[PDB]
Design an enzyme around this catalytic site. Structure first.
Site, PDB file in Angstrom:
ATOM      1  N   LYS A   1       0.820  -1.207   0.000  1.00 31.94           N
ATOM      2  CA  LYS A   1       0.000   0.000   0.000  1.00 31.94           C
ATOM      3  C   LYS A   1       0.859   1.266   0.000  1.00 31.94           C
ATOM      4  O   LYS A   1       0.631   2.164  -0.812  1.00 31.94           O
ATOM      5  CB  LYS A   1      -0.948   0.000   1.222  1.00 31.94           C
ATOM      6  CG  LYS A   1      -1.960   1.166   1.235  1.00 31.94           C
ATOM      7  CD  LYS A   1      -3.163   0.915   2.174  1.00 31.94           C
ATOM      8  CE  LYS A   1      -2.762   0.824   3.657  1.00 31.94           C
ATOM      9  NZ  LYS A   1      -2.184   2.125   4.172  1.00 31.94           N
TER      10      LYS A   1
ATOM     11  N   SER B   1       7.280   9.583  12.337  1.00 30.38           N
ATOM     12  CA  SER B   1       6.295   9.524  11.267  1.00 30.38           C
ATOM     13  C   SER B   1       6.903   9.615   9.872  1.00 30.38           C
ATOM     14  O   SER B   1       7.556  10.619   9.532  1.00 30.38           O
ATOM     15  CB  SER B   1       5.288  10.678  11.437  1.00 30.38           C
ATOM     16  OG  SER B   1       4.412  10.773  10.321  1.00 30.38           O
ATOM     17  N   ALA B   2       6.676   8.580   9.066  1.00 28.31           N
ATOM     18  CA  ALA B   2       7.143   8.582   7.679  1.00 28.31           C
ATOM     19  C   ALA B   2       6.245   9.520   6.862  1.00 28.31           C
ATOM     20  O   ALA B   2       6.696  10.113   5.875  1.00 28.31           O
ATOM     21  CB  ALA B   2       7.089   7.179   7.094  1.00 28.31           C
TER      22      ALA B   2
ATOM     23  N   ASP C   1       2.233  -0.650  12.476  1.00 27.96           N
ATOM     24  CA  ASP C   1       0.929  -1.157  12.055  1.00 27.96           C
ATOM     25  C   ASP C   1       0.681  -2.631  12.406  1.00 27.96           C
ATOM     26  O   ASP C   1      -0.434  -3.132  12.262  1.00 27.96           O
ATOM     27  CB  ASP C   1       0.753  -0.957  10.550  1.00 27.96           C
ATOM     28  CG  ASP C   1       0.929   0.502  10.151  1.00 27.96           C
ATOM     29  OD1 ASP C   1       0.422   1.365  10.911  1.00 27.96           O
ATOM     30  OD2 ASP C   1       1.557   0.785   9.104  1.00 27.96           O
TER      31      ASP C   1
ATOM     32  N   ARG D   1      -5.739   2.441  18.155  1.00 25.48           N
ATOM     33  CA  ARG D   1      -5.448   1.009  18.130  1.00 25.48           C
ATOM     34  C   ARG D   1      -5.087   0.366  19.454  1.00 25.48           C
ATOM     35  O   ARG D   1      -5.333  -0.832  19.654  1.00 25.48           O
ATOM     36  CB  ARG D   1      -4.360   0.728  17.083  1.00 25.48           C
ATOM     37  CG  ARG D   1      -4.920   0.870  15.669  1.00 25.48           C
ATOM     38  CD  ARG D   1      -3.883   0.771  14.541  1.00 25.48           C
ATOM     39  NE  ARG D   1      -4.588   0.713  13.248  1.00 25.48           N
ATOM     40  CZ  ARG D   1      -4.017   0.834  12.051  1.00 25.48           C
ATOM     41  NH1 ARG D   1      -2.710   1.031  11.944  1.00 25.48           N
ATOM     42  NH2 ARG D   1      -4.758   0.739  10.949  1.00 25.48           N
TER      43      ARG D   1
ATOM     44  N   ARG E   1      -7.502  -2.982  10.336  1.00 23.09           N
ATOM     45  CA  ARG E   1      -6.501  -3.874  10.943  1.00 23.09           C
ATOM     46  C   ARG E   1      -7.030  -4.470  12.244  1.00 23.09           C
ATOM     47  O   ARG E   1      -6.575  -5.525  12.663  1.00 23.09           O
ATOM     48  CB  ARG E   1      -5.158  -3.160  11.198  1.00 23.09           C
ATOM     49  CG  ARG E   1      -4.467  -2.675   9.907  1.00 23.09           C
ATOM     50  CD  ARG E   1      -2.950  -2.334  10.073  1.00 23.09           C
ATOM     51  NE  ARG E   1      -2.518  -1.720   8.820  1.00 23.09           N
ATOM     52  CZ  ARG E   1      -2.321  -2.386   7.684  1.00 23.09           C
ATOM     53  NH1 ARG E   1      -2.457  -3.707   7.628  1.00 23.09           N
ATOM     54  NH2 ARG E   1      -2.131  -1.707   6.561  1.00 23.09           N
TER      55      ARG E   1
HETATM   56  O1  LIG Z   1       3.691   6.590   4.740  1.00 28.69           O
HETATM   57  C1  LIG Z   1       3.050   5.550   4.778  1.00 28.69           C
HETATM   58  O2  LIG Z   1       2.765   4.858   3.801  1.00 28.69           O
HETATM   59  C2  LIG Z   1       2.548   5.120   6.141  1.00 28.69           C
HETATM   60  C3  LIG Z   1       3.281   5.581   7.318  1.00 28.69           C
HETATM   61  C4  LIG Z   1       2.766   5.183   8.714  1.00 28.69           C
HETATM   62  O3  LIG Z   1       2.091   6.351   9.450  1.00 28.69           O
HETATM   63  P1  LIG Z   1       2.929   7.441  10.360  1.00 28.69           P
HETATM   64  O4  LIG Z   1       3.756   8.336   9.407  1.00 28.69           O
HETATM   65  O5  LIG Z   1       1.842   8.344  10.969  1.00 28.69           O
HETATM   66  O6  LIG Z   1       3.792   6.531  11.295  1.00 28.69           O
HETATM   67  C5  LIG Z   1       1.764   3.941   8.709  1.00 28.69           C
HETATM   68  O7  LIG Z   1       1.332   3.807  10.075  1.00 28.69           O
HETATM   69  C6  LIG Z   1       0.624   4.160   7.680  1.00 28.69           C
HETATM   70  O8  LIG Z   1      -0.305   3.035   7.711  1.00 28.69           O
HETATM   71  C7  LIG Z   1      -1.716   3.131   8.109  1.00 28.69           C
HETATM   72  O9  LIG Z   1      -1.898   4.063   6.989  1.00 28.69           O
HETATM   73  P2  LIG Z   1      -3.338   4.803   6.609  1.00 28.69           P
HETATM   74  O10 LIG Z   1      -3.802   5.656   7.746  1.00 28.69           O
HETATM   75  O11 LIG Z   1      -4.366   3.721   6.342  1.00 28.69           O
HETATM   76  O12 LIG Z   1      -3.122   5.690   5.346  1.00 28.69           O
HETATM   77  C8  LIG Z   1      -2.236   1.712   8.027  1.00 28.69           C
HETATM   78  O13 LIG Z   1      -2.330   1.313   6.816  1.00 28.69           O
HETATM   79  O14 LIG Z   1      -2.540   1.040   8.998  1.00 28.69           O
HETATM   80  C9  LIG Z   1      -1.982   3.807   9.505  1.00 28.69           C
HETATM   81  F1  LIG Z   1      -1.523   5.028   9.514  1.00 28.69           F
HETATM   82  F2  LIG Z   1      -3.253   3.822   9.708  1.00 28.69           F
HETATM   83  C10 LIG Z   1       1.318   4.250   6.245  1.00 28.69           C
END
Ligand SMILES: O=C(O)C1=C[C@@H](OP(=O)(O)O)[C@@H](O)[C@H](O[C@@](OP(=O)(O)O)(C(=O)O)C(F)F)C1
Length: 445
Positions: free
Chosen positions: A23, A168-169, A321, A352, A400
């Site tokens: 994703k 945070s990425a 995650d 979560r 999740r």
């Molecule tokens: O840059 C990315 O691709 C992601 C970075 C992370 O968030 P942070 O920068 O806030 O640490 C993950 O936790 C996120 O995954 C989720 O991403 P989404 O919210 O749905 O977009 C997940 O899939 O569970 C989570 F953040 F919920 C995806």
């Protein structure tokens, strides 16, 4: 509305399956492909709802996207070429798409509005909106810096040097994307490494982006703005977060042997495998190779007896995650498992930490929820676990939480029910069919 599902105890799980695409990388393939000069071709794309929403947002800004056979082909607008969207950009449940696009388009001199579903609308955007304000972006948001949000970029954005305050990425990624349309050098400092898909892919598209890591682990990422980006051929690896569900199911259900093919093995994504291995899990890494510029391998997973362990705060970013599915594995391990440094779990699709602890208690698990930690004590034979009355786990619109508890029901003495399975398609539409093919019994209401 909602559609509950119930998972029932299974005989071994068995088979070989290819996991759906990653994703994180799929979202970025649509974004960079849409922005770059010329054509980008993508194979292995995750077609869950979250990714499709990002695709529609890029189309709204001028990119042309189509699927020919099994390949998505994108005609990009060229760096600096995004067009003003006619209507609000709807990201549904996807914070990744929303937060990254805020940085991407917020620095353009036109208005852009961001909206989403009930879950996304409660999540914090201040972490990305603050650095954008420093870059000269004008922000309009709801109290607490929540959606809906309308951004208006300056005629000439200001480059900044920004130290990300939490691991945070997405914040790191938003600042780098804003940097693409900003003259000068944008710098992001990350004290603890987070998934690096943005850095690796921008370099692959031709960006003048460098990463320097100090011996103490701090990362200094520099990007020269307003440079050319060139369309690329992309091969998306399998999603390691999605892999975690059939992988943990195979470890827990006695009599199991499941092989998952083409799994992304970038170390910023494999903290769960490392943790499970320390717990005694039988996970074999097969044919490690380089595919589409990323490390991938096939994983053969077999039934294992697990023991509790301490999961240090510094490992959190590499498995953020996967805490829900790890909590479920711990519910069947011998002894106690302790996990700290979990503050970030509280601002995801759902809080979560609270959703996992309540779901575990509803299903007979002994656990203690702290402000930023969780302790779980397991019952290896699964006796007394699950919910005989059929009471449903509250998923709080978090796919999740739904998937983690459906895996638990394949192992517990009593079935496990989740209140909603409809959000699973945001990132893993293949989940029900994939698990059923391995032999899992999951009944959809
Ligand atoms: O840059 C990315 O691709 C992601 C970075 C992370 O968030 P942070 O920068 O806030 O640490 C993950 O936790 C996120 O995954 C989720 O991403 P989404 O919210 O749905 O977009 C997940 O899939 O569970 C989570 F953040 F919920 C995806």
């Amino acid at each position: 509305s909602s559609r509950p599902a119930t998972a029932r105890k299974s005989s071994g799980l068995s088979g070989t399956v290819r996991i759906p695409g990653d994703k994180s990388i799929s979202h970025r393939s649509f974004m960079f492909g849409g922005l770059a000069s010329g054509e980008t071709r993508i194979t292995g794309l995750l077609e869950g709802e979250d990714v499709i929403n990002t695709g529609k947002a890029m189309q709204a800004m001028g990119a042309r996207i189509r699927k020919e056979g099994d390949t998505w082909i994108i005609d990009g607008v060229g760096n600096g070429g995004l067009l003003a969207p006619e209507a609000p950009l709807d990201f549904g449940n996807a914070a990744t798409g929303c937060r990254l696009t805020m940085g991407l388009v917020g620095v353009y001199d036109f208005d852009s509005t961001f909206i989403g579903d009930a879950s996304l609308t409660k999540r914090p955007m201040g972490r990305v909106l603050n650095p954008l304000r420093e870059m000269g972006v004008q922000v309009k948001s709801e109290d607490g810096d929540r959606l809906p949000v309308t951004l208006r970029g300056p005629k000439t954005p200001t480059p900044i040097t920004y130290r990300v305050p939490m691991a945070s990425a997405q914040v790191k990624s938003a600042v780098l994307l804003a940097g693409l349309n900003t003259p000068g050098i944008t710098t992001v400092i990350e004290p603890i490494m987070t998934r690096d898909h943005t850095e690796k892919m921008l370099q692959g598209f031709g960006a003048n982006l460098t990463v320097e890591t100090d011996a103490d682990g701090v990362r200094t990422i520099r990007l020269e703005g307003r440079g050319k980006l060139t369309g690329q051929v992309i091969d998306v690896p399998g999603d390691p977060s999605s892999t975690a569900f059939p992988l943990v199911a195979a470890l827990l259900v006695p009599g199991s042997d499941v092989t998952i093919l083409n799994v992304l093995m970038n170390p910023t994504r494999t903290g769960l495998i490392l943790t499970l291995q320390e717990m005694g899990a039988d996970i074999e890494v097969i044919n490690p190779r380089l595919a589409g510029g990323e490390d991938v391998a096939d994983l053969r997973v077999r039934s294992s007896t697990l023991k509790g362990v301490t999961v240090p705060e510094d490992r959190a970013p590499s498995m953020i995650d996967e805490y829900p599915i790890l909590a479920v594995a711990a519910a069947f391990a011998e002894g106690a498992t302790v996990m700290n440094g979990l503050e970030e779990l509280r601002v995801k699709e759902s809080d979560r930490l609270s959703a996992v602890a309540n779901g575990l208690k509803l299903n007979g698990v002994d656990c203690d929820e702290g402000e930023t930690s969780l302790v779980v004590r397991g019952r290896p034979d699964g006796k007394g676990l699950g919910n005989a009355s059929g009471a449903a786990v509250a998923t709080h619109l978090d796919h999740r939480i739904a998937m983690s508890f459906l895996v638990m029901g394949l192992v517990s003495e009593n079935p496990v029910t989740v209140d909603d399975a409809t959000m699973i398609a945001t990132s893993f539409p293949e989940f029900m069919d994939l698990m059923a093919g391995l032999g899992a019994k999951i009944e959809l209401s």
